[PDB]
Amino acid sequence: TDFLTEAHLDLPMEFESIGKAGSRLGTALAMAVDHEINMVSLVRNLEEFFARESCGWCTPCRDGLPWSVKILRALERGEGQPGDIETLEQLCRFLGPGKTFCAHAPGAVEPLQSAIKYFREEFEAGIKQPFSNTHLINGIQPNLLK
Amino acid sequence: EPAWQTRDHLDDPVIGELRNRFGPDAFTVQATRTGVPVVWIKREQLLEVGDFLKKLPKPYVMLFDLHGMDERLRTHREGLPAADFSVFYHLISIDRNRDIMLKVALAENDLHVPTFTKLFPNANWYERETWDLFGITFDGHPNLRRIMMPQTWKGHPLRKDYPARATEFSPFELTKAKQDLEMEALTFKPEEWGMKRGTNEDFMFLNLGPNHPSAHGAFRIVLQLDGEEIVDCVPDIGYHHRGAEKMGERQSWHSYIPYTDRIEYLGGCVNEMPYVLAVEKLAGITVPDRVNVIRVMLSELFRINSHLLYISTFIQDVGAMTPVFFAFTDRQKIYDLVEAITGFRMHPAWFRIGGVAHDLPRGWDRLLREFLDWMPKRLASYEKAALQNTILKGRSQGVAAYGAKEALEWGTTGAGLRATGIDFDVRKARPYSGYENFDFEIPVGGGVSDCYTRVMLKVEELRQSLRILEQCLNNMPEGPFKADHPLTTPPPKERTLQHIETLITHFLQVSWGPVMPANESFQMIEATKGINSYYLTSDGSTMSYRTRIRTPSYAHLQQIPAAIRGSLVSDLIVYLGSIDFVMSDVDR
Amino acid sequence: ATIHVDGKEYEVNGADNLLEACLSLGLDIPYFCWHPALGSVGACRQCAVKQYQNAEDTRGRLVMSCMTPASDGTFISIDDEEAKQFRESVVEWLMTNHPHDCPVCEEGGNCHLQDMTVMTGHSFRRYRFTKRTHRNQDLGPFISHEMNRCIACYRCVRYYKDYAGGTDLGVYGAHDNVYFGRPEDGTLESEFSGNLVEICPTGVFTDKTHSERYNRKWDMQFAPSICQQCSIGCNISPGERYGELRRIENRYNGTVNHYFLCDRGRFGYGYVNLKDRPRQPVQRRGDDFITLNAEQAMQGAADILRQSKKVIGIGSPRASVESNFALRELVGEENFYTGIAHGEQERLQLALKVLREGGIYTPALREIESYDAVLVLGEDVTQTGARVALAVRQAVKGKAREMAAAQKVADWQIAAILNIGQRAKHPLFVTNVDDTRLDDIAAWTYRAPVEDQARLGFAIAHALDNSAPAVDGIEPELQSKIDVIVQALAGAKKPLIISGTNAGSLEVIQAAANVAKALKGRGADVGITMIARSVNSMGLGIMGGGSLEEALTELETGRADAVVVLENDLHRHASATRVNAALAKAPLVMVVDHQRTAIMENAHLVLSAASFAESDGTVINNEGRAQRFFQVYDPAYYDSKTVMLESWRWLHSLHSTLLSREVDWTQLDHVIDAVVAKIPELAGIKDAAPDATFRIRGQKLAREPHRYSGRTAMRANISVHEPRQPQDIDTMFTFSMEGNNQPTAHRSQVPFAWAPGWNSPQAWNKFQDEVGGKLRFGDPGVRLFETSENGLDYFTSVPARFQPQDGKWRIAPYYHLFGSDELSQRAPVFQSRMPQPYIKLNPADAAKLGVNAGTRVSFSYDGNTVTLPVEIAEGLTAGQVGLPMGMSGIAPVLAGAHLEDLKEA
Ligand code: SF4
Ligand code: SF4
Ligand code: SF4
Ligand code: SF4
Ligand code: FES
Ligand SMILES: [Ca+2]
């Protein structure tokens, strides 16, 4: 289920009330997160659970949850690179209902998108190195994209 | 809307004028990526449509191109009239700065079209080539004979059912053609070449070929002379036919680039530019600005190379032999820079679909600075030593002169057309490859296209190309040398060497070929010798369905008899030296 | 049904899903996990399109086109920006773990994943983390395994398990560690495992036999040919490079063998590349051999045959109709003899008489899958006619298809169909001497001797109709099982009776005909299928001729002094000692063949015939369909000393040099016209393919792809001067790139499938009218005979019960897919797949003779004793001994024969 803030504590625990708030009622067994919990680490733990509990049938869950896991591991270690949060947002967009074979991956991407929406400053703090996907090959001048 | 987008050009005023004159059901407008309106006309209305276009308030004055197409194997013909064959007519209105492409559909058995030669006289050679390579008869043609192939040739090579490859060599056919060559001098019939009055008992018949000791190539002209006066002259061309268009139907979009190099073999990257621009239109690729500047600099370097060769060859044809030595030293400086950048001298094959093959090497600017400091003193010395000599002026001034009307009616482009006073350069009228970002002038003549006027116009064009090179040197963007399009062929090499997606794209692009979606594209450029254009038809495959190359040397060689009649033979040699043609450009 | 794709209206089938409907319309949707033969499961999520609720909808929703029905009034968009983005993202997700392997991967240039990566326009990598890796398994001699390249599309397991019925392949593990393979290292046990190399869209499963001599697809020279390894007639695309047969791809035929071969056809081609093949005519002088060119061989053979008093001919079911007819023309019809034995010939003509005079329709191989009850009598279909066994498996799954159709489940939603039809299946009743590979799906398996199988068939026919002859002495348990079979067949709406000549009994074929007649008399839509032995067995049966024993008696009495033997190893159809005696007595033996046979040491003349790769011809399958195969390459292109001609070309040139003393080779169409003029029952072979003047808009059909490489360097080590292109005056194909292979070309013969952007076997989609249907202008091949208006009478010769005899062991045939077809045994890769020859014994008989499993026993046949090790077979009834037919030393003519003095060695 999507994370909610302190201001959402006043609405009733019904299906449509939580659904209009941007989350799901789910099992209605709520979990509180205090200020001492890093949201990047928490969402990393959640996505490690969800990626390792993929059944492996369909491509977006099976091959997109581990990418989000690796991005969150890099963000937790301070080795994030530009485009990582954009990749996470696109993963939340493309793992929604109907895109995957079952509802496991939409539930996987609900906390990630909610935490990026509400606690973006913790995710941007993990980006500390420039983007580098290629090493230099001696004798070949790279195509310097702008 | 991008510049490569498919357009029907229904907002062109010529479409409305044709609607008003002939009705809305008389023709079919085809949406292409050629950039010009393409109109499918019925065969029985072709002469009326052509005369109407010729009589417009700002008329279509030049038949730019005329050729054929075998449509029998074209699978994607949506929105097109039923056609086994077709004939296209590319017409240019200079005053409107607009073009139109008329297309006539033909059935397989009814392969005849009315001739266009009463409206445009360059349709003579264009229709002879269409008959030669496609078997399309033009009714009313004065002499519809083969122009590329020999007269005793069987079949039509540009038909889709004609095999492209070389047949098995036989010395018996070679000896038969040798006997034909040695008997033609004894059994010459001056009626089969379009000539008249075959010996007044004073007309001496001479031959200039079929071997010429010059760089423009080897070709034959049959001269009818009264004393020293040329009263009739018919050319024999096709002696350097390489089947380049048929080869365009045989190579992939990427592997055809070295063939584009050898069309006008003094042009190089200039020859490559219209082909890669037309392919990028087919691919929907917009190249970055650094690609534009790199391609402009390479084309201007090769334009200076070609112009130095042309000026030195003209001076040698006049009779002074030392400026060709010095101009080849300057050509060696240009070749030093081109060798440094592309790794080759004459046929670099360095342009790519979506960019260039490599980035610029470190230290290219020093070589460009050395050439730019070396050139102007040498050019001034060339002028003072040979171009201001009164013997050269007496050999050149007033020789083979024509005006604007004769240049327009024969499809003359380049320095001859601008020497007639018509200010039409492709780099300004229809800009391409980022030429609008450069400050340069277009030299024009006073109204008479002389040998001397054409040579001096080429000298000023050399100076303007030096100006463009100086601006290229001072202003270089620090960007990519290849576009980020998926159809950029090949992809950047380092990503190919370490990324699997890029490796897959490279693998399929170099092996099966890049897939161009089914469309038609066109690109004309200001080449070293005039306007060079590529007209490409993709049927959705990895090779061209039809590659049509319009070269200016064909039109200039066809204009030769209209401008040299009544002159001396030495004037004909000077005119041949002043045209700036090559036979590979003529025959392709 | 009406659909609207990107604003364009289309008429489609409402029973199709959107992916197959759009691919049938020529639209390009990327896909991985869907296959036309396997149905839709919605795994890979690659085929996403945007579906709108109606025409005035702008938001839409991404759906899988393979899982969405193409119902009336559907509105979808393929080129929608979100759908394109999602498809590119799916490609990108598949590319994160994909190895950097394309240069050293056998799928490159033929890879569906490469094609869809390019099609989605994904070429930039932003993933920077580690790639998962996998260890590989050893899968046997045919299939190489590389699990790093897997995209987890589940096609392999779905084909292998759900379609082909194999049991040793599966998916293991979990989330991104899903592994496709066997539980341990070992050979893939399915007879149809070779279709994995085309089913797998990546380079996980690759043709290992091709991998030994690998070349890329664009470098191949292809031809449309027919598989020679049995009588089914599966259409193939042999592809060659540098003079050697490199690969056998499946060639789509919507009527015969649509997407799938068997492993014998796919991997048993290696005899063509054998170095001991005859390359030129060889004549023996004394004990020495001299090599002649073709003109000298024709002159010498014509002179010697003219000097002889009577020339007789021995054809072969290996050879084509043209070559057998040319032999029959050279020696005369009365002096022509079929190369097969007397009993084999009698069974073959009885099968032919049932097929073309029994009044019961014989279905094509694709049509087998629509029958709702199958009775197989005697024919071990999996080891002899394997593709028929695959089709029968599909026909068995027809019951789950019917129950799913009752619940309004779409026919492509294969998982729902399998869930509804859990283990319910159409009744399959197989009879053999032992257990068959069809027993896992058979409702009942009857292990009994061939006369007992025939008695079961006659009892089934009598219980279906009282006019059929009765069988006396049926046990009550066998009677109850007969009643089960009869109740299953009578209530069937479309029963199929399969038999063949491999069982080695005439009465089995007669019993199958009587069952078919009894089902026909009750108004049922019964079909009958016969399985012949070799590629042109039915053609030799239609042509006719005396048996091999008559030719042996002619050569032994001495009234025939010259014998021509065409494409025939005579030891397969007769005892070796008698053949060797009759050929050593004969003053002239001429052998026209393409393989080094055992009768070439006693052959006075040997002509280097062409194999099917180097020849054109027509072969008749067991359905009765004439099919034309075309030459793949010119053998003289690389080695100019090679004189290897078509067999009918050799024999026609011999007949011409005999008559007019002049050497005229022939053209193929002249031989076709000669066949249809002399033989009216083979008049259909004219229409099997168009003649050599056939053109597609004036141009021939290309044998090699457009990007065929190395044309100025592949012979440059021999000479730098390029030779002339080989000329094909025989057929409408050219030996070059200068031809037509458009998917829209009006033809039925397709050498290979390729379309721009579709380099994989998925280009067969472009070559079809609808995907999974037929070729666009019809499948090639025509039926020689139609269904007769009147059937036969009931065969009243019911055989007696099998009694064991002491000292007399009745030979039960045990055919093998790898080993019972002669040319495929000659292939070197089949030696690793070669089972060790074990003679099968009953436990009771082995206990009586005091031999355990693995002990060597020697038996005497034809005055010669051979030793084989014992394998215990429980299902083989007493009084029988099991022998592997067609192996080295055990001829298929031994099936149904007796055996004397079986003693422990
Ligand atoms: S979304 Fe569901 S069906 Fe797809 S892999 Fe994940 S758990 Fe399996
Ligand atoms: S399976 Fe395809 S994409 Fe993967 S390495 Fe092989 S050719 Fe390349
Ligand atoms: S091994 Fe091949 S067929 Fe099987 S799931 Fe992987 S990619 Fe698909
Ligand atoms: S079933 Fe017979 S014809 Fe078909 S591939 Fe196998 S051996 Fe060849
Ligand atoms: S093809 Fe439709 S999800 Fe795989
Ligand atoms: Ca042939």
PDB file of N, CA and C in Angstrom, chain B residues 416-441:
ATOM      1  N   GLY B 416      27.697  28.086 -64.919  1.00  0.00           N
ATOM      2  CA  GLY B 416      27.169  28.573 -66.186  1.00  0.00           C
ATOM      3  C   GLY B 416      25.867  29.335 -66.021  1.00  0.00           C
ATOM      4  N   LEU B 417      24.949  28.780 -65.225  1.00  0.00           N
ATOM      5  CA  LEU B 417      23.670  29.435 -64.974  1.00  0.00           C
ATOM      6  C   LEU B 417      23.854  30.749 -64.227  1.00  0.00           C
ATOM      7  N   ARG B 418      24.758  30.776 -63.247  1.00  0.00           N
ATOM      8  CA  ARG B 418      25.019  32.012 -62.520  1.00  0.00           C
ATOM      9  C   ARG B 418      25.796  33.007 -63.370  1.00  0.00           C
ATOM     10  N   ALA B 419      26.575  32.519 -64.335  1.00  0.00           N
ATOM     11  CA  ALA B 419      27.243  33.394 -65.287  1.00  0.00           C
ATOM     12  C   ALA B 419      26.261  34.022 -66.259  1.00  0.00           C
ATOM     13  N   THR B 420      25.113  33.386 -66.488  1.00  0.00           N
ATOM     14  CA  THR B 420      24.048  34.040 -67.241  1.00  0.00           C
ATOM     15  C   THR B 420      23.311  35.104 -66.437  1.00  0.00           C
ATOM     16  N   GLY B 421      23.673  35.323 -65.174  1.00  0.00           N
ATOM     17  CA  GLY B 421      23.057  36.339 -64.354  1.00  0.00           C
ATOM     18  C   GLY B 421      21.964  35.847 -63.432  1.00  0.00           C
ATOM     19  N   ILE B 422      21.542  34.594 -63.564  1.00  0.00           N
ATOM     20  CA  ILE B 422      20.492  34.046 -62.712  1.00  0.00           C
ATOM     21  C   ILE B 422      21.109  33.635 -61.382  1.00  0.00           C
ATOM     22  N   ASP B 423      20.647  34.257 -60.301  1.00  0.00           N
ATOM     23  CA  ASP B 423      21.175  33.997 -58.963  1.00  0.00           C
ATOM     24  C   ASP B 423      20.414  32.818 -58.374  1.00  0.00           C
ATOM     25  N   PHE B 424      20.888  31.609 -58.669  1.00  0.00           N
ATOM     26  CA  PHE B 424      20.273  30.389 -58.151  1.00  0.00           C
ATOM     27  C   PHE B 424      21.383  29.463 -57.666  1.00  0.00           C
ATOM     28  N   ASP B 425      21.593  29.441 -56.355  1.00  0.00           N
ATOM     29  CA  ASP B 425      22.469  28.486 -55.698  1.00  0.00           C
ATOM     30  C   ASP B 425      21.642  27.707 -54.688  1.00  0.00           C
ATOM     31  N   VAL B 426      21.879  26.395 -54.618  1.00  0.00           N
ATOM     32  CA  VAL B 426      21.096  25.544 -53.726  1.00  0.00           C
ATOM     33  C   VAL B 426      21.364  25.889 -52.269  1.00  0.00           C
ATOM     34  N   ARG B 427      22.596  26.280 -51.939  1.00  0.00           N
ATOM     35  CA  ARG B 427      22.950  26.580 -50.557  1.00  0.00           C
ATOM     36  C   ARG B 427      22.235  27.811 -50.014  1.00  0.00           C
ATOM     37  N   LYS B 428      21.687  28.657 -50.880  1.00  0.00           N
ATOM     38  CA  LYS B 428      20.900  29.811 -50.462  1.00  0.00           C
ATOM     39  C   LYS B 428      19.418  29.671 -50.759  1.00  0.00           C
ATOM     40  N   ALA B 429      19.060  29.150 -51.934  1.00  0.00           N
ATOM     41  CA  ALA B 429      17.654  29.057 -52.311  1.00  0.00           C
ATOM     42  C   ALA B 429      16.928  27.993 -51.497  1.00  0.00           C
ATOM     43  N   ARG B 430      17.519  26.807 -51.379  1.00  0.00           N
ATOM     44  CA  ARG B 430      16.942  25.696 -50.624  1.00  0.00           C
ATOM     45  C   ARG B 430      18.013  25.171 -49.681  1.00  0.00           C
ATOM     46  N   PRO B 431      18.237  25.853 -48.558  1.00  0.00           N
ATOM     47  CA  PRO B 431      19.403  25.551 -47.721  1.00  0.00           C
ATOM     48  C   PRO B 431      19.332  24.175 -47.080  1.00  0.00           C
ATOM     49  N   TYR B 432      20.507  23.581 -46.911  1.00  0.00           N
ATOM     50  CA  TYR B 432      20.648  22.230 -46.395  1.00  0.00           C
ATOM     51  C   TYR B 432      21.899  22.173 -45.536  1.00  0.00           C
ATOM     52  N   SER B 433      21.910  21.225 -44.594  1.00  0.00           N
ATOM     53  CA  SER B 433      23.091  20.876 -43.797  1.00  0.00           C
ATOM     54  C   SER B 433      23.645  22.064 -43.012  1.00  0.00           C
ATOM     55  N   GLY B 434      22.775  22.968 -42.575  1.00  0.00           N
ATOM     56  CA  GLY B 434      23.216  24.095 -41.776  1.00  0.00           C
ATOM     57  C   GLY B 434      23.970  25.170 -42.526  1.00  0.00           C
ATOM     58  N   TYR B 435      23.743  25.304 -43.835  1.00  0.00           N
ATOM     59  CA  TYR B 435      24.439  26.329 -44.605  1.00  0.00           C
ATOM     60  C   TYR B 435      23.924  27.733 -44.311  1.00  0.00           C
ATOM     61  N   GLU B 436      22.737  27.862 -43.710  1.00  0.00           N
ATOM     62  CA  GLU B 436      22.204  29.177 -43.368  1.00  0.00           C
ATOM     63  C   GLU B 436      22.982  29.850 -42.247  1.00  0.00           C
ATOM     64  N   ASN B 437      23.729  29.086 -41.459  1.00  0.00           N
ATOM     65  CA  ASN B 437      24.506  29.633 -40.357  1.00  0.00           C
ATOM     66  C   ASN B 437      25.853  30.186 -40.799  1.00  0.00           C
ATOM     67  N   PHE B 438      26.166  30.129 -42.089  1.00  0.00           N
ATOM     68  CA  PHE B 438      27.436  30.602 -42.615  1.00  0.00           C
ATOM     69  C   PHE B 438      27.217  31.841 -43.468  1.00  0.00           C
ATOM     70  N   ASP B 439      28.132  32.798 -43.351  1.00  0.00           N
ATOM     71  CA  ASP B 439      28.075  34.045 -44.102  1.00  0.00           C
ATOM     72  C   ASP B 439      28.978  33.917 -45.322  1.00  0.00           C
ATOM     73  N   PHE B 440      28.369  33.802 -46.500  1.00  0.00           N
ATOM     74  CA  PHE B 440      29.120  33.702 -47.741  1.00  0.00           C
ATOM     75  C   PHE B 440      28.292  34.294 -48.868  1.00  0.00           C
ATOM     76  N   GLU B 441      28.976  34.665 -49.941  1.00  0.00           N
ATOM     77  CA  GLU B 441      28.349  35.295 -51.090  1.00  0.00           C
ATOM     78  C   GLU B 441      28.235  34.311 -52.247  1.00  0.00           C
TER      79      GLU B 441
END
